[PDB]
Amino acid sequence: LDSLLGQEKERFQVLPGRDKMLYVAAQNERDTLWARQVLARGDYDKNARVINENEENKRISIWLDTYYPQLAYYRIHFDEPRKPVFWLSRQRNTMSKKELEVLSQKLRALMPYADSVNITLMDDVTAAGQAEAGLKQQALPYSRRNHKGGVTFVIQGALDDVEILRARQFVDSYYRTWGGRYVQFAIELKD
Amino acid sequence: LDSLLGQEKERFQVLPGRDKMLYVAAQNERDTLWARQVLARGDYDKNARVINENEENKRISIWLDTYYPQLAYYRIHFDEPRKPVFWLSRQRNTMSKKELEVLSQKLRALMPYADSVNITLMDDVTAAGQAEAGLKQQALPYSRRNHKGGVTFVIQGALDDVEILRARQFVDSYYRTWGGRYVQFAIELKD
Amino acid sequence: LDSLLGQEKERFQVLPGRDKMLYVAAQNERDTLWARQVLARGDYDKNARVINENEENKRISIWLDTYYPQLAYYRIHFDEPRKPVFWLSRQRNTMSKKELEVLSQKLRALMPYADSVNITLMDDVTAAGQAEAGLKQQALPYSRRNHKGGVTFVIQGALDDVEILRARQFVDSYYRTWGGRYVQFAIELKD
């Protein structure tokens, strides 16, 4: 192994894979690019791979559209890349304990660098309540619409220039940890 | 250790970490930057770290969003960096004594330079009363609104140019020690 | 010790500290600056410190906001820097004799150059009566308003150019010995 040119290793969490390849978990896009380009100049292809939170989540989601298309989930969190956390829709999900254990091992196959994948049924009430709470904190009333498989919070109120930005950060916050798979959002000028 | 180029050490409180790294508690941003740049010219990376009150509080808060998302708190004070004080929402917090002791040890892990973290349940009545008192001292009446998990004091009155600045310092004062997590503020021109 | 370049020592009251450092009590800002700059050219840092009435009072007040935030006080007088006098709000203060003795020792820790700190409960009636008297001496009637924790004397009367200056000196006088912590002031044109 190594098959690593990350040094300076700041913002490069390098994890050993189960497939005998190295996965350099880069903090951001510019770091990912830096490490991939340097490894390529260095003739460390194939075995030396560079990854990040966004690409690995989308990669697993693409695999899931084919093998667990009915999986109701939120997002895979890579706060600890060696132990990814997989947020599932508590109520929309109808999988068994053992089926979820298989799902984890399948993601472990998708993530050789991961030791194990911690799949957790996240309370759909908590998802809805997180969105509810964030809006109410910003004095943003909403009308709750119902799209297939979820709800859409339509923010009421003629918002000011910066109040709109406040609502955009709220929306992004929910889309960072939960995603747009359960509560989606809209803005409409009222009152 | 050391792995220190702070000299002149004025405004650089250097504390030894539990992880065998040094944490230079700098008085301000310009000092933080000065020390980080000088340590870097000096080839004292990794083990020689430079920190401050604002970055360390935000760093712990980011960790808390993942592991104690339901933690109702105000702010972590670094008046004594070696013994950080952690203001919690007395009433909104439902944690036990031992759970709070774990929370402290978790922050001690987040702050190797800290000897211990003193977590204290701050009276939510006192928070509200601090805001109330600061406004009344400046002859600023307010309408108490209710956002999720707190209240919003909407300052009544067509304020003058400098009265507005008086209200801004009041608001900042509360946002310095309590933060915008319980009493938030607004201004509206009346009378 | 010394660790002193004050000479000419006129307007430089040099007091020995309990922390084995020297505190040059300078008469004014320009003297403070002069002594700090000269000590610095001289390589007498650390042990040779330069102080004044305004900075030392504000320094102790900042410490008090964290450890005795409920302390109702006026101002610390440095007429005799070696024995600072600490004016407290007689009625607003609810501290015991021994708690006040601790408060003094805490300020003695904040002021190594001080032998002892004389804390005195100043009659709030006298504070109010000082303000009352100063206004009445200048033929300035006022309406007594009530802000949280104090009163605001609103000066009645269309004042002339120099009468306004007379009221400003009155206000400053009260803000010199009592401060704006109990009786505050305003001006409004009437009659």
Residue numbers in the entry:
A (entry chain X), B (entry chain A), C (entry chain B): 173 to 363
Excerpt from the publication:
The bacterial injectisome, or type III secretion system (T3SS), is a specialized syringe-shaped protein-export system utilized by many pathogenic Gram-negative bacteria for the injection of virulence proteins (effectors) into host cells. The injectisome can be divided into three major regions: the inner- (IM) and outer-membrane (OM) spanning basal body with associated export apparatus and ATPase components, an extracellular needle, and a terminating pore inserted into the host cell membrane called the translocon. The major structural scaffold of the basal body is comprised largely of three proteins that arrange into a series of highly oligomerized, concentric rings: two intimately associated proteins localized to the IM - PrgK/EscJ/MxiJ and PrgH/EscD/MxiG, and a third protein belonging to the secretin family of OM proteins, InvG/EscC/MxiD (Salmonella enterica serovar Typhimurium SPI-1, Enteropathogenic Escherichia coli (EPEC) LEE and Shigella dysenteriae nomenclature, respectively). In summary, we report the crystal structures for the cytoplasmic and periplasmic domains of PrgH and InvG, two of the main basal body components of the prototypical Salmonella SPI-1 injectisome.
For both the cytoplasmic and periplasmic domains of PrgH, we applied a 24-mer oligomerization constraint, according to the established stoichiometry. For the periplasmic domain, we observed that in preliminary modelling runs, residues 361–369 moved during the local perturbation step, and led to a model with a diameter not supported by the EM map, and relatively poor correlation. We therefore performed the docking procedures using residues 173–361, which led to a model with excellent correlation to the EM map. The model of the IM PrgH periplasmic ring is broadly similar to previously reported models from our groups and others. Importantly, our PrgH periplasmic domain model possesses fully refined interfaces. For the periplasmic domain of PrgH, we engineered numerous interface and surface mutations. Notably, we identified a loop (residues 319–324) that mediates several side- and main-chain contacts with the adjacent subunit. Side-chain mutations within this loop (K320L, T324L) have no effect on secretion; however, mutation of the conformationally labile Gly322 to a leucine abrogates secretion (middle), suggesting that the loop main chain conformation/contacts are more critical to interface integrity. However, mutant variant G322Y in the periplasmic domain of PrgH, or Q97L in InvG, disrupts needle complex assembly. Finally, analysis of the surface electrostatics of the InvG and PrgH periplasmic ring models reveals an acidic surface present on the face of the InvG ring proximal to PrgH, and a complementary basic surface on the corresponding face of PrgH.
